[PDB]
């Protein structure tokens, strides 16, 4: 089970040609010439019912729809979103200051921790400072600033997958006719797990940010536009 023995220098092209590959993997010497279950048999269950019942699985359907759709052609591409490769904008590096643009925190400045496996951005702020908790955000809906703080030698707990942030739903279990409205669960409770994780992750970044001056005041502010400056002329 060796590695590919062929470094990709540009995608689709191998660093060596077929003869070099032959030489390197040595097919000059290893040249080789030549060389369930559908039915389970259940016991009898008699008596005088002799003959074990061969019970077949994958039973034939008892109903067939009147028409159908022919199967699609084969696509050879377009893998599901689960294994899409994740691209990161070059301007984004662990520990920069970002600015929120769509969510209910429009204009806030947050700090940027590791990027989630799904491609979403796992960011947070000093909740104590800007009331921004551990929250996912999209790399496309934020503007990257040049202001970078070093966040090396900090620990991001393993239980911070996208599944951890996945929105939870309650409705609607065993309620078909909506006449008694479910007047509970509307207040999304903040479970203690989020609290403890937030506290632990911020405790190690609060002093680090407290070193460089007026970053507290920096992050407390909310970005905005005035009758002067224009975004393209600005340098972020």
């Amino acid at each position: 089970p060796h590695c590919s023995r062929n470094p990709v220098l540009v995608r689709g092209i191998g660093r060596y040609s077929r003869s070099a590959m032959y030489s390197r993997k040595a097919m000059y010497k290893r040249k080789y010439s030549a060389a369930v279950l559908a039915t389970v048999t259940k016991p009898v269950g008699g008596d005088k019912n002799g003959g074990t019942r061969v019970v077949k699985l994958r039973k034939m359907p008892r109903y067939y729809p009147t028409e159908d759709v022919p199967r699609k052609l084969l696509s050879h591409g377009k893998k599901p979103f689960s294994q899409h490769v994740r691209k990161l904008r070059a301007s984004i590096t662990p520990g920069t200051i970002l600015i929120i643009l769509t969510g209910r925190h429009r204009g806030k400045r947050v700090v940027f921790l590791k990027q989630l496996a799904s491609g979403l951005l796992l960011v947070t702020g000093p909740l104590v400072l800007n009331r921004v908790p551990l929250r996912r955000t999209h790399q496309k809906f934020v503007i990257a600033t040049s202001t970078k703080i070093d966040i090396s030698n900090v620990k991001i707990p393993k239980h911070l997958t996208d599944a951890y942030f996945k929105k939870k739903k309650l409705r609607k279990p065993r309620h078909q006719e909506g006449e008694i409205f479910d007047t509970e669960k509307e207040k999304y409770e903040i479970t203690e797990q989020r609290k403890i994780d937030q506290k632990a992750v911020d405790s190690q970044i609060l002093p680090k940010i407290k070193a460089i001056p007026q970053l507290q005041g920096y992050l407390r502010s909310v970005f905005a536009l005035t009758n002067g400056i224009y975004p393209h002329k600005l340098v972020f």
């Binding site: 008892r62 109903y63 067939y64 729809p65 009147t66």
Partner: protein, 125 residues
């Protein structure tokens, strides 16, 4: 012969129905009820058909026998099946698969029996 009957009746018939951009036909043994040489229920020397049972329960299947081509009285044999969906479906597939009785209308008949039995089953409000 068969192909004659097909072309003489293909566009004029008591059962043919031409309507707003479709065509159908209402022969007693017309699978798919569509005006086709293959699915026509009258011209073929060997023909099938499935219809609901006389009462409100079951499926009847009609087979055109071989010998009585010129005698419509005994040209068909009808048998009603009043078993569950799966066994009846298996039986009717057995008719045409094991008998080679025009093994082209097979799952056409399968679908017609399935839909007939479904419609037969009562509707939940």
């Amino acid at each position: 012969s068969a192909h004659l009957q097909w072309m003489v009746v293909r566009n004029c018939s008591s059962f043919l129905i031409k309507r707003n951009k479709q065509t159908y036909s209402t022969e007693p043994n017309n699978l798919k009820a569509r005006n086709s040489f293959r699915y026509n229920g009258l011209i073929h020397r060997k023909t099938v058909g499935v219809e609901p049972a006389a009462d409100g329960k079951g499926v009847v299947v009609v087979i055109k026998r071989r010998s009585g081509q010129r005698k419509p009285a005994t040209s068909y044999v009808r048998t009603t099946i009043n078993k569950n969906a799966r066994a009846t479906l298996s039986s009717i597939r057995h008719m045409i698969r094991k008998n080679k009785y025009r093994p082209d209308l097979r799952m056409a008949a399968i679908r017609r029996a399935s839909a007939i039995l479904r419609s037969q089953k009562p509707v939940m409000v």
